[PDB]
Design a protein around this nucleic acid. Structure first.
Ligand code: MG
Lengths: 258, 119, 164, 138
RNA sequence: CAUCCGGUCGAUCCUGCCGGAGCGCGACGCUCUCCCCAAGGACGAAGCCAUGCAUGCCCGCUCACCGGACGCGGCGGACGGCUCAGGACAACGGUUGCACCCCCCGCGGCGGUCCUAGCCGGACACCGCUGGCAACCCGGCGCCAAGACGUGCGCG
RNA sequence: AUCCAAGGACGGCAGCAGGCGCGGAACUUGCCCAAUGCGCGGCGCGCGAGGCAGCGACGGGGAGCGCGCGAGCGAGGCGGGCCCACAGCCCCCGCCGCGGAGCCGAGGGCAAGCUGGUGCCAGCAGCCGCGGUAAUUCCAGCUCGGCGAGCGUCGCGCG
């Protein structure tokens, strides 16, 4: 048993969806604690070197970050291993590139370019309501954020809209049947659909039944269901409408692209 | 002299690095990269460029590589692997010292106490 | 550990369970003579490939016609076989695959296409020419005798533009 | 019929096979442990020892030698096959001794011999019988 | 990628074993033109060790020398790497829980403190003089620095 | 187990190389942090982690010792490129141009036969068996067969 926490991470043990080459090396970046966890995040360096290709090595990323050339939720970050998660805001004013981090159908991270009208807020999921010191109510979110004195109408599992400049709630979408959702966990990551039914088993998980826009139906547990508006998404989403094609169609598309 | 036609591919702008990304392929069914520098310069100072990755395919017909055009020399001076600078006509390379002797010196120094500038 | 430990590797051929069998020896020698084969490991490689194709075809054939896996795998296998030219274009049923033989594999070798184009005097002459680097498959010169040529490049195998 | 065939009878089948599989001579000799302790070679491919004496329906006397294994200190006899190799072995010479084709059992008409000599002073017997190398150092 | 052959007899059919024929793991012998990939003191000695190396860095504290020394202080050294001795309802693998728990860095919040505040007090390090002992090790006196130590203004 | 100016002091390579012993059995006392990451810290430092090279028939893959009645082409050396932290190495370019196969066996299983020796001796032989004067099986020559830069022997597991 290791006498303390773990500071390394073998490349072969890294999450599958990060898409890291087997021969790249023995080691891989180790994300640091922050807004999101290890298995629900991705480091900055991977976005800035293996995707956008603005850097070729660790050193270039170090210089770019320490020069303060990237903003996260309106705040410059200088850690190459800082974790980037879901429904976050990515801005690079030098090239005027604004992205919101969402999930693709295949179950991997993607950058959705956006406008200036909606980059001042983010959507977050509320999953804990509790009493703090002196008995003052609080709440928490999927990005490790705490807000004091919320409205009583807000309950757990809901979704909250908050300005980037100020962490003040603007509007909240309830968790109810007939609302569009985005799956964010397991075999169905990235699929968009509307709720149809809710079944609860005492002392265990709660299962949600949704129907895609084209009629496909699927299930998952309530721990990975995210609300994105009332019958219509509040934010801009990737080109495809959360439709997971079959193997035949993907093979056809690959053949066309080749 | 078969005229050597050279292209540019995967061109990207790097205002963060103040440089321009480039993939260059040269068709010589070549002048040791020096003339390729001029050719890339005309495609996109001639000394604000550096060429590092250059391989020759089987048969020698096709050769592809990567470029790197910097806005000004100071940006290059700041952003450039040191050994690349030595390979290019940028700086002189001082005679390196073996790390073994450095390690021995460090250990001996760690041995002595107080003022150890003697060794 | 070193990164070299993760490099995969496997063999590519098999040896007959009964070695000394006169008909097999004579047939193998005859095939070497008609294809000018160096040693007997090439025939073993060919049999390995043929066995893989046959096993895949069998497994797909046991399944129902409307099986999604059956459709996918059969389509991929047929596409590969056709692009290689081993199987005729007019055939698109998995059943025909079981009737393939190593000779069809040999006919698509570089020496084969070289000879049937009348570009060479013989299989041995073709091999010796291939070694000296006088041949430009597609637009690229190739010095591998066992290089297999696809349909789209058979019309494009020429003499090296650099050879004397 | 004779054997059990009920749907809830796997335990009995496992026990029966476990008990009855000890009846095979080969399985016994391989998994019992007696042979490994009684074998002077202790499961090794071949051993290094020291020779100490030369001796030898068919009526042909076969040439062999008495040896003592360095790591074991028990005595055995190993038989030098190739012609003219008696003279190539001298008393008190280091040798390497392996086994015949049949593990454990005697081979051929030779009584009480179950090993072979394959090296003397570090030179392969085959390499010397064909004159490839020479034993001028000993 | 569902294979068999020789041996009990004066001859024949069986049971039954012996031997042969293939693959892989290692050791031994012989031999070896070219390229690519690539394991490598584990095999009842977790036996014994010369030699050399494997953990440093720096944001605070400069009347040190001409700021680089040094030392106080902070972070880290509990990660990484070697091996498989021990241990057989244990470890380990899948699946639950803490409404019986602890948790550095980091992220987000919160921040009300009972009874000289234009800024408090004394030390030690390095260092100067003086010295012990083969070596390892330290002693005594002496002014001086803190995001160090101590006290501490304040809406319970 | 070590040093001692004999009163005292000091150690734990199952970390990287190296050495003794053991065994059938296993490599350089090399260079560098440029890459992948870790600690500290702003325009960097350090890392026997890690990378590069050296030995290396554990082993795996791709070519070759000719085709033809004359031309061509390898390996090999000399120089320039490219690559590399520096050097190699692959590959490209000009000049001169080393063509080399062994290990088993020939009664059956099991594909593959001519003289001279010896005489139940010497030896072969996984089994059956040969050798007591043609020895189709030993020792040599010729011939022939198998695989092939690999071949054979020993022990273990699967079949
Ligand atoms: Mg008080």
């Amino acid at each position: 048993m290791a006498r303390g926490v773990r500071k390394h991470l073998k490349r072969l043990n890294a999450p599958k969806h990060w898409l890291l080459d087997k021969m790249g090396g023995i080691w891989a970046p180790r994300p640091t604690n922050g807004p999101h966890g290890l298995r629900e995040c991705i480091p900055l360096i991977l976005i800035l070197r293996n995707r956008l290709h603005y850097a070729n090595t660790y050193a270039e990323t170090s210089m770019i970050l320490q020069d303060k050339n990237v903003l996260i939720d309106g705040k410059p970050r200088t850690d190459p291993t800082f974790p980037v998660g879901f429904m976050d805001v990515f801005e690079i004013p030098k090239v005027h590139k604004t992205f919101r981090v969402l999930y693709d159908v295949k179950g991997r991270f993607t950058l959705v370019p956006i406008q200036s009208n909606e980059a001042g807020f983010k959507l977050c999921r509320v999953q804990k309501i509790f009493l703090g010191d002196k008995g003052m109510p609080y709440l928490s979110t999927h990005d490790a954020r705490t807000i004091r004195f919320p409205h009583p109408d807000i309950k757990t599992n809901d979704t909250i809209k908050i300005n980037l400049k100020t962490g003040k709630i603007d509007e909240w979408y309830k968790f109810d049947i007939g609302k569009i959702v985005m799956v964010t966990g397991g075999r169905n990551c990235g699929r968009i659909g509307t709720i149809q039914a809710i079944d609860k088993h005492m002392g265990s998980y709660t299962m949600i039944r949704m129907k895609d826009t084209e009629g496909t139906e699927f299930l998952t547990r309530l721990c990975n269901v995210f609300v994105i508006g009332n019958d219509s998404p509040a934010v801009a989403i990737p080109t495809t409408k959360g439709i997971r094609p079959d193997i035949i169609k993907n093979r056809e598309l690959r053949l066309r692209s080749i | 002299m078969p005229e050597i036609t050279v292209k540019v591919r995967k061109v990207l702008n790097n205002p963060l690095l103040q440089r321009q990304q480039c993939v260059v392929d040269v068709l010589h069914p070549y002048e040791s990269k020096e003339a390729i520098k001029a050719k890339v310069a005309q495609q996109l100072d001639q000394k604000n460029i550096v060429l590092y990755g250059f391989k020759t395919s089987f048969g020698g017909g096709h050769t592809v590589g990567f470029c790197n055009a910097y806005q000004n020399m100071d940006a290059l001076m700041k952003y450039e692997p040191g050994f690349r600078k030595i390979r290019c006509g940028l700086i002189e390379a001082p005679k390196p010292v073996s790390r073994k002797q450095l390690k021995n010196l460090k250990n001996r120094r760690l041995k002595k106490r107080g003022t150890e500038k003697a060794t | 550990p070193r990164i070299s430990r993760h490099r995969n590797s496997s063999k590519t051929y098999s040896t007959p369970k009964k070695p000394f069998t006169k008909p097999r020896l004579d047939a193998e020698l005859k095939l070497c003579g008609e294809y000018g084969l160096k040693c007997k490991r090439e025939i073993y490689r060919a049999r390995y490939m043929l066995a893989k194709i046959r096993r895949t075809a069998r497994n797909l054939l046991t399944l129902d016609e409307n099986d999604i896996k059956r459709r996918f795998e059969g389509a991929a296998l047929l596409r590969r076989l056709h692009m290689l030219g081993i199987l005729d274009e007019e055939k698109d049923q998995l059943d025909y695959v079981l009737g393939l033989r190593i000779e069809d594999i040999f006919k698509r070798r570089l020496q084969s296409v070289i000879v049937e184009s009348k570009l060479a005097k013989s299989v041995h002459h073709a091999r010796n020419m291939i070694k000296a680097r006088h041949i430009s498959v597609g637009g690229q010169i190739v010095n591998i005798p066992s290089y297999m040529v696809r349909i789209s490049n058979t019309s494009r195998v020429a003499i090296a533009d650099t050879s004397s | 019929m004779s054997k059990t065939s009920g749907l809830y009878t796997a335990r009995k089948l496992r026990t029966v096979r476990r008990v009855n599989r000890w009846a095979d001579k080969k399985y016994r000799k391989a998994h019992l442990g007696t042979w490994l302790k009684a074998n002077p070679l202790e499961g090794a491919c071949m051993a290094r020892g020291i020779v100490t004496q030369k001796i030898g329906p068919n009526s042909a006397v076969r040439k062999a030698v008495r040896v003592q294994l360095t790591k074991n200190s028990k005595k055995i006899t190993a038989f030098v096959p190739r012609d003219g190799s008696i003279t190539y072995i001298d008393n008190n010479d280091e040798v390497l001794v392996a086994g015949f084709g049949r593990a454990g059992r005697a081979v051929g008409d030779i009584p009480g011999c179950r090993f072979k000599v394959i090296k003397v002073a570090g030179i392969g017997l085959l390499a010397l019988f064909l004159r490839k190398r020479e034993k001028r150092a000993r």
